[PDB]
Design an enzyme around this catalytic site. Structure first.
Site, short mmCIF file in Angstrom:
data_model
loop_
_atom_site.label_atom_id
_atom_site.label_comp_id
_atom_site.label_asym_id
_atom_site.label_seq_id
_atom_site.Cartn_x
_atom_site.Cartn_y
_atom_site.Cartn_z
N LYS A 237 10.96 4.29 -83.48
CA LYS A 237 10.60 5.34 -84.38
C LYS A 237 11.68 5.63 -85.42
O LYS A 237 12.83 5.85 -85.02
CB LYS A 237 10.33 6.61 -83.50
CG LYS A 237 10.09 7.89 -84.35
CD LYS A 237 8.78 7.91 -85.20
CE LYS A 237 8.74 9.15 -86.18
NZ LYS A 237 7.50 9.23 -87.14
N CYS B 146 9.91 7.82 -97.86
CA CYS B 146 10.45 8.88 -97.16
C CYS B 146 10.91 9.98 -98.20
O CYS B 146 11.59 9.64 -99.21
CB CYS B 146 11.86 8.28 -96.73
SG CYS B 146 12.72 9.47 -95.63
N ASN C 286 13.13 12.68 -100.38
CA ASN C 286 14.51 12.90 -100.80
C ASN C 286 14.56 14.39 -101.14
O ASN C 286 14.33 15.17 -100.27
CB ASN C 286 14.79 12.03 -102.00
CG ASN C 286 16.28 11.82 -102.30
OD1 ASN C 286 17.21 12.38 -101.68
ND2 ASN C 286 16.49 11.00 -103.33
#
Ligand SMILES: Cc1cc2nc3c(=O)[nH]c(=O)nc-3n(C[C@H](O)[C@H](O)[C@H](O)COP(=O)(O)O)c2cc1C
Ligand SMILES: Cc1cc2nc3c(=O)[nH]c(=O)nc-3n(C[C@H](O)[C@H](O)[C@H](O)COP(=O)(O)O)c2cc1C
Ligand SMILES: O=C(O)c1[nH]c(=O)[nH]c(=O)c1CCc1ccccc1
Ligand SMILES: O=C(O)c1[nH]c(=O)[nH]c(=O)c1CCc1ccccc1
Lengths: 313, 313
Positions: free
Chosen positions: B44, B131, B133
């Site tokens: 993960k 992802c 920021n």
């Protein structure tokens, strides 16, 4: 028990219409959409001159949706303008004309000519921000400064309420930036979310081949693959543009799918792949199915539930 | 006939592995993935500190796929580093460790510490660039300057071959720009396409509600919805990064779906939603089904057809 609504100073028998590009390229297609039970119709996005488009095969469909790289084949703006000014029977339903010039100047040149026809006949403009790839720069709606230029120039040249057809976004900062651009323009009265999900690739396992000829098989996706993407865009711009209408497009095959678009905020609901696959009979089925869901739930109007998707907490 | 691969100085019995995030958060999960017939596993995506992630429900699945806004729940880097350094049995299969720091400095701090364990034990780094920021900016891999910065800093801090997990792109301009950034970094040896298709919205018609709690129901899409997007990204990076491996992820539920990834260019093939829904028994099924298609076609190895998708004329 009737689905009639009023938007943009026009009356509509129901919220359904074709998606631009589908059943709307020729005079025959536009007459077929006018004879259907749809509430409105939109013409094929056009350029100032006629285009052949890309080599065939350039559209294919499958159980989960479709892929296309049509290449903006169209009969040219003069044709669509003529259909709007002389041929369309406005007593049957409203007409939207989609424009997709390859530069700002071309879009300004078409809109200046469309304006007096809009004033006289009430044709509505849907400005398509998507375009063929130009190496070294992104699609216009994906380049926020280009988008702002296009809307500033069109708004100046046209001077009347119009709408913009948008590609999907996938990132919340992008929703915030794109809706802030659109909210700079008070003449942008509707936003149609979404155009195809760009540059997918369908491959056939038996032949080990892509299924469309242009662009090495890459093309925009429609249909079932894109319903949750379409609903997210519809709701994101419904929430961010409270002074505009949102028209929903993507993934509609049933009156339940339309219901979900209206819950997310759609005023009109456009049908692309499912219409290409099932033909114009789909509009009577979609109306029946939407009225059936309304009746089971106790809703008498679209207004009762438009935009009223529930969140958890 | 055989499914074996030798890449990144490791040997894999077959190309299948979990997708990061699925069946890989706890020690129990990683032992289960290790005991399965997959050819590898990935842990993960982790942060320096443990996270509980977002409130539930935060994942839901349906016939055409899944939506999630998990919030990066994980046991923290030190746990996954311990698993790689002391617990994993590398004689069973290779291990990838995914990291997903919330800033370039958090990723740098983790990869500095990972380096000696990667050198000694052979664990492979997958850096998640799809992802968050700074909130209000796009995710890292949709901000090309940020992406470059992350890659420059991680390449200096780590100093060993690694790979990157990429969001899908939808515009040819972005395929071009993104692959050019990746090709600036010779230590980026593999590129995994794709993470979920961002910020979709699933709505349940009966209850009129979104189906996950965080983000007003907006979340990343996996599964059948995303297979043609996944294939397009695998092929777009396979064509543009000829000195790198591409691993495919998105929409794999069968050996045929894996075969299409591999024809598009995929080396390893990762399984997220289908594995979450069916459990680890899926790997014996995918291996059987991919070997049957190979037998019918007379292919004896994966390199006979990897990247060999045909285009039309
Ligand atoms: C064959 C085809 C031609 C299209 N041409 C256009 C067009 O000219 N202008 C436009 O705005 N969108 C065009 N689209 C996009 C559709 O209007 C619609 O946004 C997309 O197909 C998603 O809706 P759907 O899921 O119902 O197909 C076209 C789609 C198809 C399948
Ligand atoms: C519950 C869940 C958790 C995930 N968490 C991660 C993650 O921590 N890191 C990451 O790189 N991708 C994560 N993903 C994305 C998957 O790795 C994969 O890219 C995506 O689900 C598409 O593959 P699929 O169509 O097989 O689901 C997650 C996906 C799911 C469904
Ligand atoms: O004519 C098309 O290919 C087309 N197809 C779409 O799904 N949406 C569109 O807006 C268009 C016309 C603009 C366009 C978009 C991508 C590639 C070429 C033309
Ligand atoms: O943990 C997540 O929500 C997640 N889910 C995905 O499908 N892919 C991912 O990479 C992650 C972790 C990164 C992420 C993405 C959006 C919001 C928070 C963390």
């Amino acid at each position: 028990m009737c689905l009639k609504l009023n938007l943009l100073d026009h009356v509509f028998a129901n919220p359904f219409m074709n998606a631009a590009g589908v059943l709307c390229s020729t005079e025959e297609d536009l007459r077929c959409m006018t004879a259907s039970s749809s509430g409105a119709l939109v013409s094929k996005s056009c350029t100032s001159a006629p285009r052949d488009g890309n080599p065939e095969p350039r559209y294919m469909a499958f159980p989960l949706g479709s892929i296309n790289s049509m290449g903006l084949p169209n009969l040219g703006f003069d044709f669509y303008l003529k259909y709007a000014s002389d041929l369309h029977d406005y007593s049957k339903k409203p007409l939207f004309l989609s424009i997709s010039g390859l530069s700002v100047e071309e879009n300004v040149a078409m809109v200046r000519r469309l304006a007096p026809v809009a004033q006289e006949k009430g044709v509505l403009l849907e400005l398509n921000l998507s375009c063929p790839n130009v190496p070294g720069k992104p699609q216009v709606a994906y380049d926020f400064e280009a988008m702002r230029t296009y809307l500033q120039q069109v708004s100046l040249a046209y001077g009347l309420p119009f709408g913009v057809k948008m590609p999907p976004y996938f990132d919340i900062a992008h929703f915030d930036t794109a809706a802030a651009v659109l909210n700079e323009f008070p003449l942008v009265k509707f936003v149609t979310c979404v155009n195809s999900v760009g540059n997918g690739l369908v491959i056939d396992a038996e032949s080990e081949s892509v299924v469309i000829k242009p662009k090495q098989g890459f093309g925009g996706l429609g249909g079932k693959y894109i319903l949750p993407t379409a609903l997210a865009n519809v709701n994101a711009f419904y929430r961010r543009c409270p002074d505009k209408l949102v028209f929903g497009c993507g993934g509609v095959y049933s009156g339940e799918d339309a219901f979900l678009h209206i819950l997310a905020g759609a005023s009109m609901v456009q049908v692309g792949t499912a219409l290409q696959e099932e033909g114009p009979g789909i509009f009577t089925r979609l109306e029946d199915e939407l009225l059936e869901i309304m009746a089971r739930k106790g809703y008498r109007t679209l207004e009762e539930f438009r935009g009223r998707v529930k969140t958890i907490e």
